[PDB]
Write an enzyme that holds these catalytic residues in place. Structure first.
Site, PDB file in Angstrom:
ATOM      1  N   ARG A 124       0.559  -1.171  -0.126  1.00  0.00           N
ATOM      2  CA  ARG A 124      -0.208   0.227  -0.361  1.00  0.00           C
ATOM      3  C   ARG A 124       0.722   1.391  -0.444  1.00  0.00           C
ATOM      4  O   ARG A 124       1.294   1.096   0.365  1.00  0.00           O
ATOM      5  CB  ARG A 124      -1.012   0.145   1.253  1.00  0.00           C
ATOM      6  CG  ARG A 124      -1.844  -0.879   1.393  1.00  0.00           C
ATOM      7  CD  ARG A 124      -2.680  -0.871   3.112  1.00  0.00           C
ATOM      8  NE  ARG A 124      -3.740  -1.119   2.975  1.00  0.00           N
ATOM      9  CZ  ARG A 124      -4.288  -2.352   2.761  1.00  0.00           C
ATOM     10  NH1 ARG A 124      -3.870  -3.729   3.484  1.00  0.00           N
ATOM     11  NH2 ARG A 124      -5.638  -2.457   3.453  1.00  0.00           N
TER      12      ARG A 124
ATOM     13  N   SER B 212       9.700  -5.111   5.493  1.00  0.00           N
ATOM     14  CA  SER B 212       8.905  -5.719   6.564  1.00  0.00           C
ATOM     15  C   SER B 212      10.591  -7.109   6.314  1.00  0.00           C
ATOM     16  O   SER B 212       9.980  -8.285   5.856  1.00  0.00           O
ATOM     17  CB  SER B 212       7.864  -6.707   6.893  1.00  0.00           C
ATOM     18  OG  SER B 212       7.547  -6.417   5.461  1.00  0.00           O
TER      19      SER B 212
ATOM     20  N   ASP C 166       7.529  -3.839  10.136  1.00  0.00           N
ATOM     21  CA  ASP C 166       5.960  -3.812  10.331  1.00  0.00           C
ATOM     22  C   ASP C 166       6.148  -4.400  11.898  1.00  0.00           C
ATOM     23  O   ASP C 166       4.537  -3.933  11.817  1.00  0.00           O
ATOM     24  CB  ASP C 166       5.189  -4.725   9.510  1.00  0.00           C
ATOM     25  CG  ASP C 166       6.228  -6.111   9.113  1.00  0.00           C
ATOM     26  OD1 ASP C 166       7.368  -6.525   9.314  1.00  0.00           O
ATOM     27  OD2 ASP C 166       5.412  -7.480   8.361  1.00  0.00           O
TER      28      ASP C 166
HETATM   29  O1  LIG Z   1      -0.203  -9.034   5.714  1.00  0.00           O
HETATM   30  P1  LIG Z   1       0.228 -10.480   5.792  1.00  0.00           P
HETATM   31  O2  LIG Z   1       1.858 -10.926   6.021  1.00  0.00           O
HETATM   32  O3  LIG Z   1      -0.244 -11.694   6.741  1.00  0.00           O
HETATM   33  O4  LIG Z   1       0.832  -8.746   7.526  1.00  0.00           O
HETATM   34  C1  LIG Z   1      -0.334  -7.789   7.847  1.00  0.00           C
HETATM   35  C2  LIG Z   1       0.367  -6.867   8.404  1.00  0.00           C
HETATM   36  O5  LIG Z   1       1.235  -7.339   7.780  1.00  0.00           O
HETATM   37  C3  LIG Z   1       2.204  -5.777   7.754  1.00  0.00           C
HETATM   38  O6  LIG Z   1       3.141  -6.449   6.802  1.00  0.00           O
HETATM   39  C4  LIG Z   1       2.068  -4.708   7.608  1.00  0.00           C
HETATM   40  O7  LIG Z   1       2.753  -3.400   8.133  1.00  0.00           O
HETATM   41  C5  LIG Z   1       0.057  -4.607   8.039  1.00  0.00           C
HETATM   42  O8  LIG Z   1       0.039  -2.621   7.368  1.00  0.00           O
HETATM   43  C6  LIG Z   1      -0.533  -5.574   7.550  1.00  0.00           C
HETATM   44  O9  LIG Z   1      -1.727  -5.273   8.677  1.00  0.00           O
HETATM   45  O1  LIG Z   2       6.661  -9.976   7.896  1.00  0.00           O
HETATM   46  C1  LIG Z   2       7.450 -10.172   8.812  1.00  0.00           C
HETATM   47  C2  LIG Z   2       8.445 -10.852   9.067  1.00  0.00           C
HETATM   48  O2  LIG Z   2       8.692 -11.487   7.615  1.00  0.00           O
HETATM   49  C3  LIG Z   2      10.153 -11.348   7.572  1.00  0.00           C
HETATM   50  O3  LIG Z   2       9.951 -12.291   8.712  1.00  0.00           O
HETATM   51  C4  LIG Z   2      10.715 -10.465   8.190  1.00  0.00           C
HETATM   52  O4  LIG Z   2      11.739 -10.965   8.106  1.00  0.00           O
HETATM   53  C5  LIG Z   2      10.415  -9.456   8.756  1.00  0.00           C
HETATM   54  O5  LIG Z   2      11.341  -9.153   8.830  1.00  0.00           O
HETATM   55  C6  LIG Z   2       9.230  -9.212   8.736  1.00  0.00           C
HETATM   56  O6  LIG Z   2       8.989  -8.600  10.500  1.00  0.00           O
END
Ligand SMILES: O=P(O)(O)OC[C@H]1O[C@@H](O)[C@H](O)[C@@H](O)[C@@H]1O
Ligand SMILES: OC[C@H]1O[C@H](O)[C@H](O)[C@@H](O)[C@@H]1O
Ligand SMILES: Nc1ncnc2c1ncn2[C@@H]1O[C@H](COP(=O)(O)OP(=O)(O)NP(=O)(O)O)[C@@H](O)[C@H]1O
Ligand SMILES: Nc1ncnc2c1ncn2[C@@H]1O[C@H](COP(=O)(O)OP(=O)(O)NP(=O)(O)O)[C@@H](O)[C@H]1O
Ligand SMILES: O=P(O)(O)OC[C@H]1O[C@@H](O)[C@H](O)[C@@H](O)[C@@H]1O
Ligand SMILES: O=P(O)(O)OC[C@H]1O[C@@H](O)[C@H](O)[C@@H](O)[C@@H]1O
Ligand SMILES: O=P(O)(O)OC[C@H]1O[C@@H](O)[C@H](O)[C@@H](O)[C@@H]1O
Ligand SMILES: OC[C@H]1O[C@H](O)[C@H](O)[C@@H](O)[C@@H]1O
Ligand SMILES: OC[C@H]1O[C@H](O)[C@H](O)[C@@H](O)[C@@H]1O
Ligand SMILES: OC[C@H]1O[C@H](O)[C@H](O)[C@@H](O)[C@@H]1O
Ligand SMILES: [Mg+2]
Ligand SMILES: [Mg+2]
Ligand SMILES: [Mg+2]
Ligand SMILES: [Mg+2]
Ligand SMILES: [Mg+2]
Lengths: 899, 903
Positions: A524, A588, A642
């Protein structure tokens, strides 16, 4: 003026017409309906009991089986040997063992001690104690079974009446008894009623046998019914045998117009008054006493023996069914009546002998007619299920009255054909009783218990105990501590990365920020407006943009151009294309940061893999794509994981939130560490948020002694073979692949899918989070589990679907426990670094697995509670995504890029 | 000629995919039809996208509604608060007053707490401006979002849609949340009695005026419909009579990609920018909050391709929200349309030419027409369902309608009504516009739900009288305990309603009893004659024979000589039967009534209890009446050795094998208990050495008044109307002869009050005995579908409906639950006394128990046991069922008899 016409009139109510029998049959037809229905069974008198037997023998059984038969006229123990392929063959040897009055009427213990002592003797004399043969138990009493190797006694009938048995599972009672005598061990694998074994015996030889009928000490019948009519069992495929327990027909008073005063009198002298009333008008244990009761009455009224009563005549049990049979023989019947009545003392005349014959005749023909009526209801049901004008079926029969009475069977057969002209029945007489059959059911139960034995051994490798989970927590703690310390950090697998966010939100944050959300399930671009003060406000807006897998696994530079290009689309959509604005980059993936606005990608994770990104500063890569587009300038102020943005989000309102957790595509956590503990960043004042990158726990082999073959296949076929091992046992991208490989194995062993490994089962990703959560929902019934598996593309039966679900559960449960053992470590490390005895802490969490799974979050919170009992942890779900938080952190750059 | 395309033809080609023909709409309708069916069945609901949700509204107003109540309207374009008055049976018609509270974005999007605090704030102010905080007005809550309701005053939010997205609410019950805000504030009290959907409120508003109204239709910010379904077809509701409005939640039609063939790129881009992507997909093609963005999306792409504005695109044309649905309306105006198009487009900066205005009007017309066609297809499905539930060839119905788009667009309602009528040619439909909101209707629901709750509150108030707190139960134990003492004390045998009668059985069995005994069982459900052979060998065995004999109530309540003359014909008969007439034989007489005993083989009847009342018995010795009838017979002879209470016979039976069993309990036709008491404590029997079984005659507890406290109207009625008014009061709140008479009396009342049985007290409900231990046991079983509870009751002769069947079963559990607790208070005393007597700190003891009620009732034995474990926590009491009657036990006592004798 004959004597026969008088008796006919005296016993008029026992002489049933075809119209009355057609009426009995319709009622039995409704009782069966009542007993199969989930609505009416709790009150139905005709229990229509599931037997877990799904077909008559198919020629493929082989083995050597011990078999018990208790409940009819003799207690027997058989040794049945059966082999095929080659040459022709089933051998049986058996022994009758007596069971006295004190045993059948004593304590349940005394009875089963008795049984285990005859079993011991049996195997002893043949020397098979160690040959360890599966045992089959023909126990001829109504039992409630949910599987072939449980038998819960509903109620005694006939002659047995032992305390402590009713309400209990008599296979545990039997085991208890055997255990009690150390002599041997017995693998009891099946319980069967005498009707089903009869049917199975007759069905070994006649492929259209679908009924088993007993007309002996007691009466009953069993029949093959459609699974989709048996409400009390889950499934609708094929058929299962049902034990009607027809003896009980009329126990609620529905045959009161048929039963006579002789029947009411017999019931009162009985060992079960009120119960088994149809049985009391039919079966061998009663008919003799029925005629006796009539002879005493005729005698008292001067209609027999010119009214002479003797004590003998008046004595319970002094006239047997074997005397009713002898009396009805064609040439000798009258000679037999004189001898026997003469033995009873009434100085009988020749007329009395013809009168006693006539009475014997009407009682046993009334028996014959009644079972013709309930047997024909069964045949009308078989024929209706089948869809056919005529029905040809074979009924296996057994029982001493049936076998030895010289008129009964013939009378029975004739009535049947009159009552049911559209059905052709062959009666097959079980010459050697039910052992062959019980043995045949014991063979199938046995092959199935072996397959169960094997699924359970595979599944138990996923089981973790408290003690196991406390060792994972303890390893996690030893690992956070090596990633934090300067000396050990480079070799550490859990990097404890500094995010440069030094506090939770302090209420001063204010401004309009752009944000990016990259690395979860959707990318997003966001615009968040934050206003501090009196009326505090947060205003968010967002747009989802897809990123082709081509791009996600293309060039770093295609990836970031693709990013800016949706940014540009998004600034148009919010009406802010032109102005230079600050942006927080929620990315992330594990980043080595030297400040808030810098982040070097350490390695990819999850599904991403663009080239030339690892080793570079993702803020740089983004700033080269902006300049590159030359459309707008932007000011990238912060790179955020994240976890951290989730913690920041949840802490905007909740000051006790110092921990973030994600369980979605990947899994990871962050928390507020004291700077004294962050040896990799200079300074000891205050705290810092640490991005643990806990996915990589185990990457040095430290969970190997808990990882399974299936965990090693998923890791080895991954995009990052060897890395993020823990995440690989926990998150939404990988749980389904674990479950899929387990199912692959089980299919190759024939346990599932008829042994056919299909194209669907070979496709990666078939079990995504959304389906894993549904399949496991308490909201769904097996029916809807099966329909999910079918829409995925799998050819799944009800049994298959029960096993896919168990599997899904084992893997999802283990993931929540592993996730709880790591969170356990984190909260303990915060509590105990602070010198506290009781820590209350809030964890802000997000991710699709966590949000959609019906069990994960509950099991995890429970795990954290059990392993870290001094922390009281609250989990606060973030419903708005990570943006508010990246936005709150972005406000902190700005201020600091603004000095 | 050869016709050449103009702008209009070209745009129909460009937007072909939105121009849906009668064939495509008939396909959608049929898809919707299968989804509804899908939603109502228990086999497909858990994955259905059309939730088809139950609302608890069973019909359209019938005009009895009267009173005055608030009514909250949350989730449309305006948060409104109304006041609704009606009471025609007296004069004054419905009269409506309302407000309108400005709710800002930050609230519609903040926390649920902020959201509900704001709603609580507004209700307060609205209550002051009017000065009604102090009246106690029932409140109705139209809350326009999908909610799971198991009753009318619960609303668990399934999911946010349209404009709202407040955290911490989904999964929570908005009634709880609202109350919780209200509570925290202080200003006032709110009785919130019902939550409905704006669809249901619309249907009821319109139904109040047209009794043909069966559908509620909303085409505003969002779109949804609701209709009246046959309870026969609502699998998620238990019941099969009458109807219940269903709230389909048709906005989520197609979530699961089942509309992916009609959805376009325009609808996929709108979903990407909305607050709930992947959700409410059919609504996103239809409703007011989306039609304006959908046109704007088409215009941007047409501008990018050069079809509009000669390719010019401004930043306004590119900005979310800048073309709204009221812009689509104004452009579609008949006269002023093209000129409205001019203004609107010029404010967008695009320098629109006259061709550009005609083009945009046309895209607006295709977008809004597709929306009207869509709702005609899904309503078409709901109407066909309605026709198929009626079974006619044609259907006649009114649809009640609300929503800003339907009201304001110049062409929409017309084209809707038309495509609708053409899709469903066998239906005659009227469309009635809810001119003034959904509040009249919500108020009508609030009014039916308020009346229903007053009934419910009055049923609970009667029933709470049977609810016994842990310290009350504790005071009953202490009371039972003080009566024990009184009945033992030589000088207190008076307000000693609990007699503590000595059985003269001095010990439990002792492996030496041996012989052939006759025994008699009189007092319980069957009168039986028994032969009991006991051998003591190294082979310990017990052989039993018995035979039940009726006692025709022309003997039960006839004379005593005539009662015993009968017992003795039956004994004569049983010896022939067993083949043993001749031998003088010893007999144990189990006679289940209170007797004063001067020894094992004599006992004077103290009173008749239970159903017995044969004359010339009380004050006589039963072993003497037994002996007489045997001489009248002047046939055989036997030697009566022992007269025993069923209680002492059960304990002994059970202890024949269990040395711990020092207590005996009966819960059947009557209720009673016995235990081994120390002789220093049995004041009425000389001798301070050893032990003695005491027949408590515990049912008489409460005969002096000491339970008056917990006895109810219904208990006094049962007692006054009984063979023994004033006595066995405690037994009368426990046993199986009396339980169903309490329930019967409860039901008589509730039926007079109108709560049950359509208010008629029938000849069946006025028959003593209807509720036997066997039906109370079935009625309360845990494996019972409610359909079966009803069947049974109808079997009995009661005209029970589903809801009657629900309250009859709740009345039965309340009574049967108090009975098991009261029993357990009693047993808690016995077992704490035996412990105390023995100066023990902890006692392990086993009770032998018998009785049809104890055996058949699903819950009784489980609650009694719980009670005893909670009130005597220092005792560890096991209960053993006597599976074969107390004859073994009486026989064992007859063995001791013969010893202690012919010494
Ligand atoms: O979408 P997923 O991999 O299940 O993780 C869900 C959440 O993911 C994080 O990586 C995003 O920043 C959040 O804003 C989202 O709500
Ligand atoms: O999205 C959840 C997690 O995915 C993987 O672990 C990435 O290495 C991590 O940084 C992120 O926080
Ligand atoms: N429904 C009935 N119930 C009781 N007794 C019956 C019934 N029908 C016939 N009987 C008696 O059964 C005897 C004859 O039956 P059975 O010999 O088995 O029939 P059959 O061979 O077809 N006819 P038959 O020529 O009379 O011998 C006579 O004593 C009849 O009174
Ligand atoms: N199925 C359809 N889907 C989309 N647009 C349609 C569809 N059918 C017709 N149209 C357009 O709808 C318009 C006609 O609207 P209609 O309600 O039938 O009359 P009208 O022209 O608006 N009436 P009036 O108010 O008298 O001027 C034309 O512009 C058609 O091109
Ligand atoms: O012994 P009966 O009551 O006469 O019944 C005869 C048959 O009864 C069953 O209980 C046994 O399983 C059979 O193997 C036996 O042959
Ligand atoms: O406000 P709109 O979404 O346009 O819908 C129109 C109708 O909305 C409902 O939700 C309200 O309950 C009605 O009172 C209102 O008249
Ligand atoms: O027959 P009920 O009143 O239910 O109680 C059942 C029991 O009560 C006693 O009076 C009898 O002596 C027992 O042998 C009988 O089993
Ligand atoms: O043995 C014949 C029949 O006897 C009694 O009816 C039993 O209850 C039944 O289970 C059995 O099949
Ligand atoms: O307000 C109109 C309709 O809007 C939305 O679609 C809601 O989900 C629905 O419950 C409401 O009836
Ligand atoms: O039958 C159970 C109890 O019923 C009544 O209470 C009798 O008075 C009592 O003696 C008997 O023990
Ligand atoms: Mg089934
Ligand atoms: Mg004949
Ligand atoms: Mg440091
Ligand atoms: Mg229903
Ligand atoms: Mg004394």
């Amino acid at each position: 003026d004959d004597q026969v016409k008088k008796i006919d009139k005296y016993l008029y109510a026992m002489r049933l017409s075809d119209e009355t029998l057609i009426d009995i049959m319709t009622r039995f037809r409704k009782e069966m309906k009542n007993g199969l229905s989930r609505d009416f069974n709790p009150t139905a008198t005709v229990k229509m009991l599931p037997t877990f037997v799904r077909s008559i023998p198919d020629g493929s059984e082989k083995g050597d089986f011990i078999a018990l038969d208790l409940g009819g006229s003799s207690f027997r123990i058989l040794r049945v040997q059966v082999n095929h392929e080659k040459n022709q063959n089933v051998h049986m040897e058996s022994e009758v063992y007596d069971t006295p009055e004190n045993i059948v009427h004593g304590s349940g213990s005394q009875l089963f001690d008795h049984v285990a002592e005859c079993l011991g003797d049996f195997m002893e004399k043949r020397k098979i104690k160690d040959k360890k043969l599966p045992v089959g138990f023909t126990f001829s009493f109504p039992c409630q079974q949910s599987k072939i190797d449980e038998a819960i006694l509903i109620t005694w009938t006939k002659r047995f009446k032992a305390s402590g048995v009713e309400g209990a599972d008599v296979v545990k009672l039997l085991n208890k008894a055997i255990k009690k005598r150390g002599d041997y061990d017995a693998n009891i694998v099946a319980v069967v009623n005498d009707t089903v074994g009869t049917m199975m015996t007759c069905g070994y030889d006649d492929q259209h046998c679908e009924v088993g009928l007993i007309i002996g000490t007691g009466t009953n019948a069993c029949y093959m019914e459609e699974l989709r009519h048996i409400d009390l069992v889950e499934g609708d495929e094929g058929r299962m045998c049902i034990n009607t327990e027809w003896g009980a027909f009329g126990d609620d008073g529905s045959l009161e117009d048929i039963r006579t005063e002789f029947d009411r009198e017999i019931d009162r002298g009985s060992l079960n008054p009120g119960k088994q009333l149809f049985e009391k008008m039919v079966s061998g244990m009663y008919l003799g006493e029925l005629v006796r009761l009539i002879l005493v009455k005729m005698a008292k009224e001067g209609l027999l023996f010119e009214g002479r009563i003797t004590p003998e005549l008046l004595t319970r049990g002094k006239f047997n069914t074997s005397d009713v049979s002898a009396i009805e023989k064609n040439k000798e019947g009258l000679h037999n009546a004189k001898e026997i009545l003469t033995r009873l003392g009434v100085e009988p005349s020749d007329d009395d002998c013809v009168s006693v014959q006539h009475v014997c005749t009407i009682v046993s023909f009334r028996s014959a007619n009644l079972v013709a009526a309930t047997l024909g209801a069964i045949l009308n049901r078989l024929r209706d299920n089948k869809g056919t004008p005529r029905l040809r079926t074979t009924v296996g029969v057994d029982g001493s009255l049936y076998k030895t009475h010289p008129q009964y069977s013939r009378r029975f057969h004739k009535t049947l054909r009159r009552l049911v002209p559209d059905s052709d029945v062959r009666f097959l007489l079980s010459e050697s009783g039910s052992g062959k059959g019980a043995a045949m059911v014991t063979a199938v139960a046995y092959r199935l218990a072996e397959q169960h034995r094997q699924i359970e051994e595979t599944l138990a490798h996923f089981h973790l105990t408290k003690d196991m989970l406390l060792e994972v927590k303890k390893r996690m703690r030893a690992e956070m501590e090596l990633g934090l310390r300067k000396q050990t950090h480079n070799n550490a697998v859990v990097k404890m990365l500094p995010s440069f966010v030094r506090r939770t939100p302090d209420g001063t944050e204010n401004g309009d920020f752009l944000a990016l959300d990259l690395g979860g399930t959707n990318f997003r671009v966001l615009l968040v407006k934050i206003r501090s003060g009196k009326k505090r406000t947060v205003e968010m807006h967002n747009k989802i943009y897809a990123i082709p897998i081509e791009i996600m696994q293309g060039t770093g530079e295609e990836l970031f151009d693709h990013i800016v290009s949706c940014i540009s689309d998004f600034l148009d959509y919010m009406g802010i294309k032109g102005p230079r604005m600050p942006l927080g980059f929620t990315f992330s993936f594990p980043c080595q940061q030297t400040s808030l606005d810098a982040g070097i990608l350490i390695t990819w994770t999850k599904g991403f893999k663009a080239t030339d990104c690892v080793g570079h500063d993702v803020v740089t890569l983004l700033r080269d794509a902006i300049k590159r587009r030359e459309e707008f300038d932007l000011d990238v102020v912060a790179v955020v994981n994240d976890t951290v943005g989730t913690m920041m989000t949840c802490a905007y309102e909740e000051p006790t939130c110092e921990v973030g957790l994600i369980v979605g595509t990947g899994s990871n956590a962050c928390y507020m560490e004291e700077m004294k503990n962050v040896e990799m960043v200079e300074g000891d004042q205050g705290q810092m948020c640490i991005n643990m990158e806990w996915g990589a726990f185990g990457d040095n082999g430290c969970l190997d002694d808990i990882r399974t073959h299936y965990d090693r296949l998923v890791n080895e076929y991954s995009l990052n073979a060897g890395k993020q091992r823990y995440e690989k046992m926990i998150s939404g991208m990988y749980l389904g692949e674990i479950v899929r490989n387990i199912l692959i194995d089980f299919t190759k062993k024939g346990f599932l899918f008829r042994g056919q490994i299909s194209e669907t089962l070979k496709t990666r990703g078939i079990f995504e989070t959304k389906f894993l959560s549904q399949i496991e929902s308490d909201r769904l019934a097996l029916l809807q589990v099966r329909a999910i598996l079918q829409q995925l593309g799998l050819n799944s039966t009800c049994d298959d679907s029960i096993l896919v679900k168990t599997v899904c559960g084992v893997v999802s449960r283990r993931a929540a426990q592993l996730c709880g053992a790591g969170m356990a470590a984190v909260v303990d490390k915060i509590r105990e670094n602070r010198g506290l005895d009781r820590l209350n802490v809030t964890v802000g969490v997000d991710g699709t697995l966590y949000k959609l799974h019906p069990h994960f979050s509950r099991i995890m919170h429970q795990t954290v509670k059990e392993l870290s009992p001094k922390c009281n942890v609250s989990f606060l779900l973030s419903e708005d995504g990570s943006g508010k938080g990246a936005a709150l952190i972005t406000a902190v750059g700005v201020r600091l890029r603004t000095e």
